[PDB]
Design an enzyme around this catalytic site. Structure first.
Site, PDB file in Angstrom:
ATOM      1  CE  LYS A  59      -4.764  -0.399   1.651  1.00 36.63           C
ATOM      2  CG  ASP A 160     -14.703   3.215   3.859  1.00 33.84           C
ATOM      3  OD1 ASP A 160     -15.626   3.153   3.380  1.00 33.84           O
ATOM      4  OD2 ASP A 160     -13.578   3.177   3.213  1.00 33.84           O
ATOM      5  N   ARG A 164     -16.437  -3.356  -1.177  1.00 39.49           N
ATOM      6  CA  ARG A 164     -15.223  -3.033  -1.703  1.00 39.49           C
ATOM      7  C   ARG A 164     -13.991  -2.912  -1.064  1.00 39.49           C
ATOM      8  CG  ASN A 165     -13.456  -0.336   1.702  1.00 44.63           C
ATOM      9  OD1 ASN A 165     -12.501  -0.260   0.842  1.00 44.63           O
ATOM     10  ND2 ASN A 165     -14.407   0.608   2.239  1.00 44.63           N
ATOM     11  N   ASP A 178      -8.761  -1.471   4.458  1.00 45.76           N
ATOM     12  CA  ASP A 178      -8.987  -0.241   4.529  1.00 45.76           C
ATOM     13  C   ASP A 178      -9.512   0.384   5.888  1.00 45.76           C
TER      14      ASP A 178
HETATM   15  N1  LIG Z   1      -3.752  -7.173   0.466  1.00 47.76           N
HETATM   16  C1  LIG Z   1      -4.428  -7.144  -0.895  1.00 47.76           C
HETATM   17  N2  LIG Z   1      -4.342  -8.120  -1.327  1.00 47.76           N
HETATM   18  C2  LIG Z   1      -4.820  -8.149  -2.734  1.00 47.76           C
HETATM   19  N3  LIG Z   1      -5.439  -7.167  -3.204  1.00 47.76           N
HETATM   20  C3  LIG Z   1      -5.595  -6.085  -2.418  1.00 47.76           C
HETATM   21  C4  LIG Z   1      -5.064  -5.775  -1.226  1.00 47.76           C
HETATM   22  N4  LIG Z   1      -5.274  -4.781  -0.659  1.00 47.76           N
HETATM   23  C5  LIG Z   1      -5.965  -4.085  -1.749  1.00 47.76           C
HETATM   24  N5  LIG Z   1      -6.170  -4.712  -2.867  1.00 47.76           N
HETATM   25  C6  LIG Z   1      -6.870  -4.484  -3.955  1.00 47.76           C
HETATM   26  O1  LIG Z   1      -6.779  -3.093  -4.240  1.00 47.76           O
HETATM   27  C7  LIG Z   1      -8.147  -2.539  -3.906  1.00 47.76           C
HETATM   28  C8  LIG Z   1      -8.265  -2.050  -2.400  1.00 47.76           C
HETATM   29  O2  LIG Z   1      -7.234  -0.925  -2.168  1.00 47.76           O
HETATM   30  C9  LIG Z   1      -9.120  -3.456  -4.209  1.00 47.76           C
HETATM   31  O3  LIG Z   1      -9.545  -3.436  -5.884  1.00 47.76           O
HETATM   32  C10 LIG Z   1      -8.316  -4.894  -4.006  1.00 47.76           C
HETATM   33  O4  LIG Z   1      -8.587  -5.989  -5.190  1.00 47.76           O
END
Ligand SMILES: Nc1ncnc2c1ncn2[C@@H]1O[C@H](CO)[C@@H](O)[C@H]1O
Length: 296
Positions: A59, A160, A164-165, A178
């Protein structure tokens, strides 16, 4: 300002328990862009005692980040150091010096819960014949309920919660993610924001929308919307209704109708999460028990 103090403090601090050598991290493709920044697939060499390479997610800040986005990243970092639970995404480390801030987290192979449910629509002949069973969907809800019960027990409001999260990892295990918007609530049991929030309108509790008050009970509201997403295999709530119309719609007591492929018992749970009076909504411990009653 507050952020410069945070950045200045965070830079001075060492934190050997979480710092990771940037030279031991190799970044790959983008997995998606959210708020605060983007996420990419990566592999980490000699991570937390694990020999060899481990596959991870990373991230990081997006291009042209704002102060609000930088604050959310640091806020998610600080929260993730404190939580450890099988249904909460796991933090492995961070890269701070000699480059941009990177958070290293558990890789969830199936991506977000919403995308995983929408992709499942393509499997099989059509909408009248689904690939996931209702029992699988209840399990997901129950797993998420357990993680929220844990987060509530340590006085965190997630704020949140939405499909999606939520992340789906190996074994189709749910992982709450998230945490940029979550807030510690130990002292007062609520968090209040004077400014307009950045949570989507259609997931916000009615007292968060009008009065800007966030508690564990507004998390339960969002969880009710999440149940709706799950049961509709990633449907969009309040379909066709502009968000600006939600103020009046909720004030007058209207709620989403019972969707297709949703038992009456599951709908009763949704509606209880959407009660106008927060204390009339169930707590997550009761939601887990109610979801268990639906299991076969
Ligand atoms: N640990 C994670 N592993 C795989 N995909 C993630 C991860 N974190 C976020 N994402 C992807 O990024 C987005 C969320 O930030 C979503 O589309 C999700 O698929």
């Amino acid at each position: 300002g507050p952020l410069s103090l945070s950045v200045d403090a965070f830079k001075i601090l060492a934190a050997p328990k979480w710092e990771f050598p940037r030279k031991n991290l190799v970044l790959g493709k983008t997995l998606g862009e959210g708020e605060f920044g983007k996420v990419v697939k990566a592999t980490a060499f000699h991570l937390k005692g694990r020999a060899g390479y481990t596959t991870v997610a990373v991230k990081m800040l997006k291009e042209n980040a704002s102060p609000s986005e930088l604050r959310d990243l640091l806020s998610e970092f600080n929260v993730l150091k404190q939580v450890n639970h099988p249904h909460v995404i796991k933090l492995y480390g961070a890269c701070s010096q000699d480059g941009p801030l990177l958070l290293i987290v558990e890789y969830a192979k199936y991506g977000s819960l919403r995308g995983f449910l929408r992709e499942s629509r393509k499997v099989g002949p059509g909408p009248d014949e689904r690939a996931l069973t209702m029992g699988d969907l209840i399990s997901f809800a129950w797993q998420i309920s357990q993680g929220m019960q844990y987060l509530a027990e340590m006085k965190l409001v997630h704020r949140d919660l939405a499909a999606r999260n939520i992340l789906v990892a190996e074994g189709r295990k749910m992982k709450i993610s998230d945490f940029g918007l979550s807030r510690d609530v130990y002292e007062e049991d609520f968090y209040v924001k004077r400014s307009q929030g950045r949570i989507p309108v259609k997931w916000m509790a009615i007292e968060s929308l009008f009065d800007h008050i966030y508690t564990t009970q507004s998390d339960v509201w969002s969880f009710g919307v999440l149940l709706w997403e799950i049961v509709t295999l990633g449907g969009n709530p309040y379909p066709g209704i502009p968000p600006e119309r939600l103020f009046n719609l909720l004030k007058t007591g209207h709620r989403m109708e019972r969707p297709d492929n949703c038992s009456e018992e599951m709908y009763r749970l949704m509606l209880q999460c959407w009660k106008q009076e927060p204390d009339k909504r169930p707590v997550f411990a009761d939601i887990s028990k109610d979801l268990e009653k639906m299991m076969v």
